[PDB]
Design brief:
The structure is a homodimer. By secondary structure, chain A is α+β, with helices and mostly antiparallel strands. Chain A has one domain: Aminopeptidase (3-Layer(aba) Sandwich), CATH 3.40.630.30. Chain A contains six helices and seven strands, in the order αβααββαβαβαββ. In chain A, strands 1-2-3-4-5 form a five-stranded mixed beta sheet, with helices on both faces. Chain A is globular, with a radius of gyration of 16 Å. Chain A starts with 9 loop residues before the first helix and ends with a strand. Chains A and B meet through helix 2, helix 3, strand 3, helix 4 and strand 4 of A and helix 2, helix 3, strand 3, helix 4 and strand 4 of B. Strand 5 of chain A pairs antiparallel with strand 7 of chain B, so a sheet runs across the interface. Chains A, B: One of its GO terms (biological process) is UDP-N-acetylglucosamine biosynthetic process. Chains A, B: Its EC number is 2.3.1.4. Chains A, B: It catalyses: D-glucosamine 6-phosphate + acetyl-CoA = N-acetyl-D-glucosamine 6-phosphate + CoA + H(+). Chains A, B: Keywords: Acyltransferase, Disease variant, Dwarfism, Endosome, Golgi apparatus, Membrane, Transferase.
Chain lengths: 182, 182
């Protein structure tokens, strides 16, 4: 378990924030998430930084073993297709938000990449920090930078408005789903 | 460009075909797709068995390079996460249908895998040969055996009756989208 990021952190700091289409108030950015905050890729030491306690808020996982974490991490890391991003409160040394960008590869559209935004969560006692908006914008604009032809996500109809702020529109296509688990 | 399949063909035959819920008249299978038809992993040779001709029936496939193709294929094969499956018409040597199962890795649900179905297309002269149904049942069931806790896809509302066949249900969730290319 080390500090080695999943992707090159230059990728985040080189994102053109002028291209952000959402209302920030106060105006924050990836470079300046807020007092005592760092927006960065996930690394292996984040295991001990309450990363699962932030994910698990969204949905109760089972005890993921350290070994299991590093395998998942490494496969994701050297795929080049996962951009698991985290906000750290440095003053407490804990993770306080996370969101994932997945690059999918296709053959259609000149062998193009499309993005998927997955697993956007912000810690319960850490609302009003705009880290949801912040991660969404960052991750959205990160996919453009990675030259995705498009980027998609699922949301509840109630938050359908929250996402229009990032350039997203409601597709006429339905999301369809089959559970094997439960 | 050679016959090297993207994943193990074994994976296809080991799909528990007794678990298919969809109707087939006549009863066709991963082993018996029809007279003169084989169901297999994509391989690089497929380039000139008109793979891109079929995909062209799904969506614009700009000037695609044999090399840009070969590279993309390799990355998908190297990940172990891409299951681009095709039907060759072994007699006429052409691909006549494709669909892809992408395996997606999580940290949630005890570092679970979920699957997506993408890029389902049947050549415009393979109607009545039941290939849509077959591909969609095969990968849905392949995802089960690969241990996906769920599998999902996106379709027009009018295509809904079709995917229910394999026990997909419409989600309560909006599918939202940003296009970068136009």
């Amino acid at each position: 378990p080390d500090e080695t990021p999943m992707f090159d952190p230059s990728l985040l700091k080189e994102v053109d924030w002028s291209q952000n289409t959402a209302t920030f108030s106060p105006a924050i950015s990836p470079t300046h998430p807020g007092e005592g905050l760092v927006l960065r890729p996930l690394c292996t030491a984040d295991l001990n930084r309450g990363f699962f306690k932030v994910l698990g808020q969204l949905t109760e996982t089972g005890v993921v073993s350290p070994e299991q974490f590093m395998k998942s991490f490494e496969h994701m890391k050297k795929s080049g297709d996962y951009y698991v991003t985290v906000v750290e409160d440095v003053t407490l040394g804990q993770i306080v938000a996370t969101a994932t960008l997945i690059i999918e590869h296709k053959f259609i559209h000149s062998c193009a990449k499309r993005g998927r935004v997955e697993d956007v969560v912000v810690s319960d006692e850490c609302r009003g920090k705009q880290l949801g908006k912040l991660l969404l914008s960052t991750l959205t604009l990160l996919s453009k930078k990675l030259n995705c032809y498009k980027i998609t996500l699922e949301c509840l109809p109630q938050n359908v408005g929250f996402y229009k702020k990032f350039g997203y529109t409601v597709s006429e296509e339905n999301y369809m789903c089959r559970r094997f688990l439960k």
